[PDB]
Amino acid sequence: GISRDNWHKRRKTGGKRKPYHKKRKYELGRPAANTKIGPRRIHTVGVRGGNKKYRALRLDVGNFSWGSECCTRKTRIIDVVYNASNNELVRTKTLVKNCIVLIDSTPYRQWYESHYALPLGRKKGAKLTPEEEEILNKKRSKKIQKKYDERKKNAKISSLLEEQFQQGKLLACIASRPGQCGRADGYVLEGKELEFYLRKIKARKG
Amino acid sequence: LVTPRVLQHKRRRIALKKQRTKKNKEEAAEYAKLLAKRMKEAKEKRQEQIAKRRRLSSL
Amino acid sequence: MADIQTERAYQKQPTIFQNKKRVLLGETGKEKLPRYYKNIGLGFKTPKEAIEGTYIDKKCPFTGNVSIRGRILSGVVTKMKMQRTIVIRRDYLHYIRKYNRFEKRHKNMSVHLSPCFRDVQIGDIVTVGECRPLSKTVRFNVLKVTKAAGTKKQFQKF
Amino acid sequence: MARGPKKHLKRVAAPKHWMLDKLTSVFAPRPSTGPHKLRECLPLIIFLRNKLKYALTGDEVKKICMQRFIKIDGKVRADITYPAGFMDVISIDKTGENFRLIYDTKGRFAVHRITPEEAKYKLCKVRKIFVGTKGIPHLVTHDARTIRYPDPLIKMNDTIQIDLETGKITDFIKFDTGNLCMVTGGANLGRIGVITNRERHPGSFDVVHVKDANGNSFATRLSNIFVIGKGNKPWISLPRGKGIRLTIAEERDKRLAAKQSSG
RNA sequence: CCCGCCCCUUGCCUCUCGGCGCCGGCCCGAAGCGUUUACUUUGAAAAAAUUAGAGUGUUCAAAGCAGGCCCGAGCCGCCUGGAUACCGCAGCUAGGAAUAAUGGAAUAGGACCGCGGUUCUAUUUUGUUGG
RNA sequence: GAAACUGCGAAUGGCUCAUUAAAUCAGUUAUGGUUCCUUUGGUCGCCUACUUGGAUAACUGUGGUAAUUCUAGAGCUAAUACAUGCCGACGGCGCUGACUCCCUUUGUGUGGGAUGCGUGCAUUUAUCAGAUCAAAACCAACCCGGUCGGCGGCUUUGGUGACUCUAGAUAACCUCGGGCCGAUCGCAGCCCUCCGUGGCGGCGACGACCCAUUCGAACGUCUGCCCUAUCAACUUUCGAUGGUAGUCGCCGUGCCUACCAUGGUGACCACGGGUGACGGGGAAUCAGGGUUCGAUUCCGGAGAGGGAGCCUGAGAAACGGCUACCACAUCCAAGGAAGGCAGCAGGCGCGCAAAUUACCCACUC
């Protein structure tokens, strides 16, 4: 119906070619996923040669990663901020490859606190002392220090990172096609990208 | 309804599975012998090359 | 180089990561970027200029994804007035067997040009090679540029 | 016509090395899918009534194959058509006969009878090396056998002897200059001669010179060469003719010399 | 009209890795190529039928791809064909160097381990790992 | 052993030449840009298991409609249909380290260690590895040839001309109703610290996941075209050419969308128009060079009254499948229903112009 033909469209000279063969099943469209954020709705689509293709509508979880220290945990996908293909897609909260979105930022802290033995940015130390100090202080004899010594000075954590934990959000990059895969996935922004997209955000809105 | 014939097909079903595992054992055994054999010839060749180099250096 | 972004998106090479390990350079140092390149094979050689320089382009074969496989051809420059591509020409001779004469015919083709080459001028010989499609009228990329023909680009004392 | 795959091949579309006539009807057998390619096959039924003449109609072959007197590559087959090709062994055990499929210097599959002892193995070219899962290698051959754990010096364009009984190759030949080769396709076909020289081009369609023991030099593409044994010493049995590739004048001279068309 | 010689002769080197030699030392095949093309010559690769054309007594022929042999059956068989040529172009391969285009140092750079001045970089070795 | 469910085929063939001028098609090349039923070869263990769950047909019986290969209601009963889900043999791996022992409090050098979680392949993402070049002089931690501060001796998959290849490691992701790892069927044998059980062996049949193969399919490269200028400028936000990102698709790609640039093509004939133009292998004539024809038995393509959409399947935008509009034409109790001979015969019409409503699966497939 809606098709992805190539026997339409002008040649280089501005010429036209007269109608040749009728539309066929291997040149075919099928309308866009237009996936949002919400409760999971998945549809299974039969596709050529078999080998079913998953189309995801309204995901709310993706597997992001923090490849700086190589941990990857499942985290909720809150809202869109920047979509580098169009401005309109952000307004209706459409989710596609290479967007910039927000997450809860929760397990990354839990991992950091247990492994590097330090909290991130904090409102107050009063919260920590009755519980959440129980993990941070430890009763080991022998391997209070012995393990943790090797973790020291490999946890400088950068300025633009640390400030974001306090808000409870982090900026990560969709590196999947949700409409073809059936899953959202990605990597979290680091380095110069994370400097770049801040400037685009503050430029465009506000 | 279970009959003796049924149980044969299930007994032969598992006999083949065990036979399969025993075969992947023996192949990897022979290949390891063969693989470890070559670790010898190659070494010898390397030694020879080294000797040649030394001779060349001589002058 | 220090600016290579003018898009609404960030530009970078695949197969590159930015580590956050160690901290001590003093003033400056590693630009926090190792360069990516690869061999092309077939007796063609990567330019020094590619490995030196900084550009992000995915359609050149010295950096980005695209192979050269199948045919290899030549041509000549005729025009450049487009960004990251050129136009070229192929002069050749068509024979007729009723007569015993030939006649001239030419076709024109576009082909993509790397930001690596920037010494191109209109009238240089160019070499190209078959590739997977990049665009509607681009199927090729440059492998090499040369000048070795009459009325050279600069005075003889080289 | 086409919307999916075809299931007919006519008489006149079919290759000429099956030596078909033109006064039986429009269709020809067409080999069904298998390890060999249809411009290199000899379909089974063409061996049984257009060569050896046991059968006379296709319905007879259907009554024969069902009885399970036929084998191919030491296993039992039971269909009108099977795509056996170069270097396979047919085995009828009732007659005590064994055949081999190999090329005349004319370039067509002949009758090359052999001892049953010879018919316990065949010679197979290697074409591709492919590392499988968990550090295990594979071979790929033209008869489409995947033989795991080969020796680690065997590479493509070599040939390997396979025991039909147990698989799992016992020995091999290594591709080297001066070894004896047979041709399997192209304009030169069925010629036997030593390698002599190689030629390489980065790219594709490398060629391979050849010379025989009649003092003639010729060349062919790389991928039409098959190795048969070391220099002037085949590791297989050879038919009459022996890759000489006589001119037409000399062939005339032989026939009028023996005066041979009667016994 | 295939080796060499006058200066040249398939122009050179540089060498280094895997063979041939001769008595550590020395010699010569393969590796980059001779500024680029047309042209010409050799290979490769080319569906069948048709066509040309070899063989074969279709009763001769148009055709066809067959068929021919010795024995009362007592051989339980023997022998043999189903060639070869052609296939505009364009593309692939190798040889030739006349002919027709194209090529270089004249506001100099070609040659030699000729030296200086200046800068960047390669990761090998002092058994290993770090400064 | 009728019938009926299930599996498979019906996308092959046959027919026509209407469309179609760089399109079709031919030679040549490319998948390192992809999909592939089937065959062939490999892949086959991290109060239920002596076998799980509940309905449909045929069948039995009662009906409706003018009419259809129309169809309702009631009573039964199956599975390689349908929906479920164990067991066996896990004595698997890394990182935590309750702890405990020796020598330097610690740190750090040590040996064992309970207790936790993950630990087949497939799927998606991030990260790491994917080694060897050419030599020395001292200092810091150190093996061996060996000694109570210092000398000599080593270093580790596969493949291509060329890949972000193949295989490996780490951290995770999991699709259920929507990955795999058999609750299936037929022939004929055995063995029991032993008496029909607990065990196991051969020969098949079917099904399923992945890899390879075969038959292809689909896009892409270079070159090749009849008449016409009383057709010379054409193409563009109704994307024309390119750049960047995304969507979609089996994949590559302005294929499509957003943003941005202003290009692309032509006297070497573009663009436009015409063709009683399907293309090629070929055919007729012919000294040499040519001219003319090719609907038509082989190969490729396109189409089934004209248009469009779609289901099923590995493969179809199918017409011996379906739905709608338009042009036709048929039946009707006027409520409705049914149709597409460019398949073989046959009829009407059209014309200068063209055969039997025959016999038969024996051959060839």
Curated annotation (Swiss-Prot), chain A:
Record Pfam families: Ribosomal_S8e (PF01201)
Sequence ranges of Basic residues compositional bias: 7-25
Location in the cell: Cytoplasm; Membrane; Nucleus, Nucleolus
Record's keyword annotation contains Mitochondrion: no
Gene Ontology terms: biological process: translation
Bilayer disposition of the protein: Lipid-anchor
Annotated GO MF terms: structural constituent of ribosome
PROSITE patterns membership: RIBOSOMAL_S8E
InterPro entries linked to this entry: Ribosomal_eS8 (IPR001047), Ribosomal_eS8_CS (IPR018283), Ribosomal_protein_eS8_euk (IPR042563), Ribosomal_Se8/biogenesis_NSA2 (IPR022309)
Gene3D superfamilies tied to this protein: 3.10.290.70, Ribosomal protein S8e, subdomain
Function: Component of the small ribosomal subunit. The ribosome is a large ribonucleoprotein complex responsible for the synthesis of proteins in the cell. Part of the small subunit (SSU) processome, first precursor of the small eukaryotic ribosomal subunit. During the assembly of the SSU processome in the nucleolus, many ribosome biogenesis factors, an RNA chaperone and ribosomal proteins associate with the nascent pre-rRNA and work in concert to generate RNA folding, modifications, rearrangements and cleavage as well as targeted degradation of pre-ribosomal RNA by the RNA exosome.
Protein name in the entry: Small ribosomal subunit protein eS8
GN (gene name): RPS8
Curated annotation (Swiss-Prot), chain B:
UniProt region (Disordered), positions on chain: 39-59
Bias kind Basic and acidic residues: ranges: 39-51
Subcellular location: Cytoplasm; Nucleus, Nucleolus
Disulfide bonds: none
Post-translational modification: Ribosomal protein S6 is the major substrate of protein kinases in eukaryote ribosomes. The phosphorylation is stimulated by growth factors, tumor promoting agents, and mitogens. It is dephosphorylated at growth arrest. Phosphorylated at Ser-57 and Ser-58 by RPS6KA1 and RPS6KA3; phosphorylation at these sites facilitates the assembly of the pre-initiation complex.
Record-listed Phosphoserine modification sites: 57-58
Sites of N6-acetyllysine modification: 33
Subunit structure and binding partners: Component of the small ribosomal subunit. Part of the small subunit (SSU) processome, composed of more than 70 proteins and the RNA chaperone small nucleolar RNA (snoRNA) U3.
Family: Belongs to the eukaryotic ribosomal protein eS6 family.
Role summary: Component of the 40S small ribosomal subunit. Plays an important role in controlling cell growth and proliferation through the selective translation of particular classes of mRNA. Part of the small subunit (SSU) processome, first precursor of the small eukaryotic ribosomal subunit.
Protein name (record): Small ribosomal subunit protein eS6
Gene name per UniProt: RPS6
Residues shown, of full length: 179 to 237 of 249
Swiss-Prot record, chain C:
Organism: Oryctolagus cuniculus (Rabbit)
Keyword Phosphoprotein found: yes
Record NCBIfam families: PRK08572.1 (NF006345), uS17_arch (TIGR03630)
Listed PANTHER family: 40S RIBOSOMAL PROTEIN S11 FAMILY MEMBER (PTHR10744), SMALL RIBOSOMAL SUBUNIT PROTEIN US17 (PTHR10744:SF52)
PROSITE patterns: RIBOSOMAL_S17
PTM-bearing positions, type N6-acetyllysine: 38, 45, 58
Location of the protein in the cell: Cytoplasm; Nucleus, Nucleolus
GO CC annotations, alphabetized: cytosolic ribosome; cytosolic small ribosomal subunit; nucleolus
Quaternary structure and partners: Component of the small ribosomal subunit. Part of the small subunit (SSU) processome, composed of more than 70 proteins and the RNA chaperone small nucleolar RNA (snoRNA) U3.
Classification via CDD domains: Ribosomal_uS17
Keywords: Acetylation, Citrullination, Cytoplasm, Lipoprotein, Methylation, Nucleus, Palmitate, Phosphoprotein, Ribonucleoprotein, Ribosomal protein, RNA-binding, rRNA-binding
Modified residues (Citrulline): 22
Protein name: Small ribosomal subunit protein uS17
Residues recorded as bearing Omega-N-methylarginine in the entry: 69
Gene Ontology BP terms: translation
Residues carrying lipid (S-palmitoyl cysteine): 60
Domain of life: Eukaryota
Entry-annotated residues carrying N-acetylalanine: 2
Curated annotation (Swiss-Prot), chain D:
Disulfide bonds: none
Covalent crosslink: Glycyl lysine isopeptide (Lys-Gly) (interchain with G-Cter in SUMO2): 230
Gene3D superfamilies: 2.30.30.30, 2.40.50.740, RNA-binding S4 domain
Family per similarity comment: Belongs to the eukaryotic ribosomal protein eS4 family.
Name of the molecule in the record: Small ribosomal subunit protein eS4
Annotated GO CC locations: cytosolic ribosome; cytosolic small ribosomal subunit; nucleolus
Keyword tRNA-binding included in the entry's annotation: no
GO molecular function: rRNA binding; structural constituent of ribosome
Cell compartments where the protein resides: Cytoplasm; Nucleus, Nucleolus
Residues spanning the membrane: none
Function, in words: Component of the small ribosomal subunit. The ribosome is a large ribonucleoprotein complex responsible for the synthesis of proteins in the cell. Part of the small subunit (SSU) processome, first precursor of the small eukaryotic ribosomal subunit. During the assembly of the SSU processome in the nucleolus, many ribosome biogenesis factors, an RNA chaperone and ribosomal proteins associate with the nascent pre-rRNA and work in concert to generate RNA folding, modifications, rearrangements and cleavage as well as targeted degradation of pre-ribosomal RNA by the RNA exosome.
Quaternary state and interactors: Component of the small ribosomal subunit. Part of the small subunit (SSU) processome, composed of more than 70 proteins and the RNA chaperone small nucleolar RNA (snoRNA) U3. Identified in a IGF2BP1-dependent mRNP granule complex containing untranslated mRNAs.
Signal peptide feature range: none
Source species: Oryctolagus cuniculus
GO biological process: translation
